[PDB]
Amino acid sequence: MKRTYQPSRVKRNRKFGFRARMKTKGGRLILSRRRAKGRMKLTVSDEKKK
Amino acid sequence: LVNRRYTAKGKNLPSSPKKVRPIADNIRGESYIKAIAVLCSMPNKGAKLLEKVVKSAASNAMYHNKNLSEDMIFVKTVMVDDGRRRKKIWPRARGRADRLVNRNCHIFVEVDEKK
Amino acid sequence: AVPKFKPSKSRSRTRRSINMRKKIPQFQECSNCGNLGVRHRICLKCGYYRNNQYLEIGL
Amino acid sequence: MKTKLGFNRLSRKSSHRRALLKNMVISFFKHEKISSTKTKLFEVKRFAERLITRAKVDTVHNRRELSKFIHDKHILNKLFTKISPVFRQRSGGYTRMIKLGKRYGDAAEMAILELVEKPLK
RNA sequence: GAAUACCAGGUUGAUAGGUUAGAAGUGUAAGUAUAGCAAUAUAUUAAGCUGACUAAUACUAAUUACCCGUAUCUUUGGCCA
RNA sequence: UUAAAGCGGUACGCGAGCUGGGUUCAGAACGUCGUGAGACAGUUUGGUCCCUAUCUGCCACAAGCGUUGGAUAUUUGAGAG
RNA sequence: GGACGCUGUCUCAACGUGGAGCUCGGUGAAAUUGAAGUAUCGGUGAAGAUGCCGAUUACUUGUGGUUAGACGGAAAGACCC
RNA sequence: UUUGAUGGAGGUAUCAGAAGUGAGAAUGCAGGUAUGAGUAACGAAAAAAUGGGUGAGAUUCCCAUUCGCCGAAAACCUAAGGUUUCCUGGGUAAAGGUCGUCUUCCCAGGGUUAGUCGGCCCCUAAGGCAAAGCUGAAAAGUGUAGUCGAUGGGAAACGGGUU
RNA sequence: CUCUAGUCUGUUUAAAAAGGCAGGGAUGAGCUGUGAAUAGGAGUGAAAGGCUAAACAAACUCGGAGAUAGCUGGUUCUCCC
RNA sequence: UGAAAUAGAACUGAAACCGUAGACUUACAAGCAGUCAAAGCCGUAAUUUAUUGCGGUGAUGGCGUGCCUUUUGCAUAAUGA
RNA sequence: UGGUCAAAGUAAUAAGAGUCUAUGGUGAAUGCCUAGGAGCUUUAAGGCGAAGAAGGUCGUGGUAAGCUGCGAAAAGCUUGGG
Ligand SMILES: [Zn+2]
């Protein structure tokens, strides 16, 4: 059964990448929150996939 | 009670005590020759583990008591306790998972000079 | 199809002791080497059986 | 209750049982002595003794029958030339199956099958 | 006959297997020969082959084998002494 | 047709035995009522029947043990179907 | 809804084949679980008794089957309020 | 509160004060271990068998001979993805639904060579951003000139051999 | 290559929606790869109260929030009157 | 070696759980597993010594519907472990 | 009186299970301790960055896996004081 996570890469980087996060207000809030919490991974761009 | 000069102990052996105890019952109190023959014959994992421990116990007794041969020795006592457990996962339908315990046993054998 | 009450240790012990019971194999000392071998089987230690070689026992 | 006496079915469907018997008989004739499960060897000897008694007399027609079961040419020739001429006289019982004990691991009953008299070399 | 148990037998034995033979199934094999261009037919041929059964036959396998296993004692009656 | 085609109880016997036709979901249509949303033991069609048996109970086969010396056979019979 | 043909759907079941089930060896769960040296019948009772009264039956302990019960397990009933 | 075993380093009378001050249950929480139970399964009805070698240890490793299965594939070559899983050597705590000398397991070492391939690049589809202009409490929303955006369009290679 | 009437296995399954048999479409209201656009009182819907990351009569995450409950459950050592 | 190796990848190491050995009891019996009586066996102290106590097991007799929560009222087959 | 026999009581078995006594295994509760925390007081400091911040990637070790430090001059360098 084709299911929930057909894994593209251009979709991954475009929709959830660091530049897509910085591109708007809420994404920058996301980045600040994750920095404050001290996450080891900020965005999907830490998975080097292009 | 133990003459710990004459004994062997095997800790964390890869079998379940529930499966090793019957084989121990069949050789408790027998002569060494008869017990060794039984353990060699019977094709059970517990049988092989007991064979190693019993042979080691007899070896220790012989080494510390040079005038004791293979045919004055009888298996005086035999104890089989339970040892560490490891849990691994067996996945089933509908996302249900079950934990699948693996048991080990301790084995203690003491031999003694026959009547 | 599920146990209604946990059984007593007596019942569990009884069932376990009766079922998990293995029987000794019969024996008969080899005519050649004197080992105690399973009756009606080739000797595993010397290979003979009724004074006939059948195996070639290695290590 | 059980009907169909004469087999052990060797725990496998008919075609695979026939193939099993053919291969083990071939190997038995090739090697003069083999080890296997007691049931398998029992059926093997039931058929091997039959083949030997059929091959006691060497003719074209008999050879062409024995080919319907022995598909190794070398071993068919060996059976007709080297094996039977030593059992020309024996009224039966050319083989000998002797038990070996319970095998470690799955506790099968092993046994050894061999010829009573080794053939010509 | 589920593992059981019972029963039969264990070299002093036909218990099983093999083998021989028969009750029987298939219904005329392979090879060769004749006739036909060939297909095919006929003779060899109640053939060949298969024989879950039955009757024999120690040829092969059940070993020069291992564990369990008998009037406790008291009182009374009868017989014997 | 048969000599005769009885009346009741047992969770209107019996779904951890089976069947889902009906009853009693979400579809749709018809009749009627309500302004309408909808309602109607009015009608028609479609519409998952889960669970490896612990104990008791029952159908069968064994192990251990007793039956007062210990065993091997033949049987009288309570009782039961 | 009816007709023709065809059939193990049925009277009526039997046999055979394959995967499980059965025994042994290795590995090894689950839900449930106050425990248990837990018999039945007639009665009583939070009004359907394994636990009470009376009575009856029953050497001790397993295994393979089948679910009659333990108002079985699973889902703080979906129906009613 | 007294005597022992175990234990090897801090407790505590009297009086007075203060509480996270006393668990048997909440389909309680956390951890360990019974129970069912050595019972159901051990994952498709494509099928294995013999001999030999390695090894302490082989029905399950390796090699050889037969048999069986797929064969508009269960074959081969490239994407989408995975990221050392690839090769050589060594080893079996765990893990592999069993065993294991074996493995996509572990450890060490080694391994990916481009002018002609695929990208990068020069172009644009849908689309996104977008000075200016215009519109809105803010944050922005619309939107022109432009600029980005391939599954598209554009220069160049084939055969054979080697580890 | 795409779909699922009917039936069966499965339903503490191999699969949190398959598989074994079969059926419809099969040059078109066609299937499908690779990108992009529509986000929650909104979107989308050849229209069934469907779908929108396995759950939709108003998605999910965080915060208000320890929301409010005439409802249910639980509430731990002792003695005397 | 160390004060210690039932200090050897870990201090003190209980309960739940799994065992071994010894003593006693049990295979004619219907036990909320307890209490009140009680023969015999075993351990032990006194009394000159086999009858009284501290003890552990216990044939047999009498009595006895687990607990919690909730209800006019529960062993209840109401609830919860 | 001994033996045989008849009769009435009784001892001698535990495949297994139940209860004590002596012993262990499994398990990590209790006791004890702290390598890390929590709640505040008294001072000081309350910004950083286009002279490129905060926060990260990559790389730097005789040899490192991670962390930290550091920035191809890369677990450091120069000057001054201690
Ligand atoms: Zn020998």
Do residues A17 and A43 make contact, with C-beta atoms less than 8 angstroms apart? yes
d(CA D91, CA D73) in angstroms, rounded, equals 27
| Closest among B98, B55, B107 to B80, alpha carbons compared | B107
Partner chains of C (3+ C-beta pairs under 8 Å): B, D
Query: Which backbone phi and psi does C13 adopt, to 5 degrees?
Result: -60, -45
Where helices occur in D1-121 by DSSP H, the ranges are: 14-31, 38-54, 60-67, 73-78
Do residues B68 and B58 make contact, with C-beta atoms less than 8 angstroms apart? no
Do residues A44 and A16 make contact, with C-beta atoms less than 8 angstroms apart? yes
Query: What is the structure's resolution, reported in angstroms to one decimal?
Result: 3.4
Q: Which nucleotide is nearest to B94 (CA to C1')?
A: I16
Do residues B14 and B104 make contact, with C-beta atoms less than 8 angstroms apart? yes
Which two three-digit tokens encode residue C35?
A: 């080992």
Other C-beta atoms within 10 Å of C34: how many?
11
- Contact, C20 CB vs strand H, < 7 Å: yes
Rounded to a whole number of angstroms, the CA Rg of chain B reads 17
d(CA B18, CA D70) in angstroms, rounded, equals 50
Other C-beta atoms within 10 Å of B37: how many?
22
CA distances from B17 to A20, B83, D121 (A): 60, 9, 55
Which two three-digit tokens encode residue D114?
A: 């061999």
Strand C27-29 to strand C36-38: parallel, antiparallel, or no bridges (unpaired)? Answer: antiparallel
What is the 8-class DSSP label of residue A45?
Answer: G
Do residues D55 and D88 make contact, with C-beta atoms less than 8 angstroms apart? no
What are the residues whose beta carbons fall under 8 Å from the beta carbon of D62, sequence distance 6 or more?
D54, D55
CA distances from D8 to B54, C34, D40 (A): 41, 36, 8
Pairwise CB contact (< 8 Å): C42 & D101: yes
Structure method: cryo-EM
Query: CA angle, D45 as apex, C26 and D84 as ends, to 5°?
Result: 130
Which two three-digit tokens encode residue B104?
A: 């080990």
State how far Cα A34 lies from the chain centre: 11
d(CA C58, CA C55) in angstroms, rounded, equals 9
Query: Which backbone phi and psi does D77 adopt, to 5 degrees?
Result: -65, -40
Pairwise CB contact (< 8 Å): C41 & D99: yes
Other C-beta atoms within 10 Å of B27: how many?
25
- 3-state secondary structure (DSSP) of residue D68: coil
Instruction: For residue C48, report the distance from its CA to the centre of ligand 1, in Å.
Output: 5
d(CA D50, CA D62) in angstroms, rounded, equals 13
Place of tokens 């074209």: D60
DSSP string of D85-99, one letter each residue: GGSSS--S--EEEEE
Do residues B47 and B36 make contact, with C-beta atoms less than 8 angstroms apart? no
What are the residues whose beta carbons fall under 8 Å from the beta carbon of B30, sequence distance 6 or more?
B38, B74, B75
| Closest among D47, D66, D69, D68 to D57, alpha carbons compared | D66
Other C-beta atoms within 10 Å of B50: how many?
29
Instruction: For residue C32, report the distance from its CA to the centre of ligand 1, in Å.
Output: 5
d(CA C27, CA D21) in angstroms, rounded, equals 33
d(CA B75, CA B114) in angstroms, rounded, equals 9
Query: CA angle, B52 as apex, D110 and C19 as ends, to 5°?
Result: 65
Query: Which backbone phi and psi does A26 adopt, to 5 degrees?
Result: -65, -35
